[PDB]
Design a protein that fits this description.
Two copies of one chain form a homodimer. By secondary structure, chain A is an all-beta fold. The first copy, chain A, is built from no helices and 13 strands. It is classed as sugar binding protein.
Chain lengths: 152, 152
């Protein structure tokens, strides 16, 4: 709970960072992509990208925690190799050397992002989400698994 | 051989069927769960379930030999009380009234299943395996022991 959830595809178990893998069928409404991992002890930044294809030219949603200037998270979109206007959440919900549950929920108008079961940010779709078929994870973290679940 | 193996937990010796017991720490990669037993002389079916908790609502892997319509084995997953698509191995590697060695090996992407030291089926993880902390065995069999071993 509070929702019943079903595997939408097989989990990636102990993925090695940097990780690039498919989201099979592309992102769909109601999908929860959950990353369970550990922020490194001397982390500077990490990145979770939801993107069309392996190139990283088109990133629907770039999630970029930065342990800099007090701690903040950047959310942005990249189109045809070009970054849009950043959305800076002036708070750091991750902690160096500590385990986290990072969950991305795909609604029709926005992504909702949960860190450790608590709501952290919303990010409104700038481009269509069904065109995302790739998750790329890199930077100062370790991961223990990634799950893909739906309410259907 | 061909591998050196170490107890990952104490064996269950002469467990009484139906049997429900813990997998301590949950399933982990490289674990071999070995059931040594006897198929009854008038067996219809038996079941080995790897599940989260005692309720049987969430069965990561359901292993269900059926001495029906020529003999076949069902492998399936149950989530939130709901069965997924079955995987039917159209072969029966058990024999009525006869002893068997049933061995389940946990790899990162799949379970490998050995019957009598020979490979029988593979079953790809539909849900994470570390969440399994319970083995449930029931149906038309007797067991002499269950072992849990790792290569570590």
């Amino acid at each position: 709970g509070s929702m019943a959830l079903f595997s939408a595809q097989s989990p990636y178990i102990n993925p090695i960072i940097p990780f690039t893998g498919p989201i099979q069928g592309g992102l769909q409404e109601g999908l929860q992509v959950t990353l369970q991992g550990t922020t490194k002890s001397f982390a500077q930044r990490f990145v979770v990208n939801f993107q069309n294809s392996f190139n990283g030219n088109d990133i629907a949603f770039h999630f970029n925690p930065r342990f800099e200037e007090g701690g903040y998270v950047v959310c942005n979109t990249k189109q045809n190799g070009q970054w849009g206007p950043e959305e800076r959440k002036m708070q750091m919900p991750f902690q160096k050397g500590m385990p986290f549950e990072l969950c991305f929920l795909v609604q029709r108008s926005e992504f909702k992002v949960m860190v450790n079961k608590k709501f952290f940010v919303q990010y409104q779709h700038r481009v269509p989400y069904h065109l995302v078929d790739t998750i790329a994870v890199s930077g100062c973290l370790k991961l223990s698994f990634i799950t893909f679940q739906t309410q259907n």
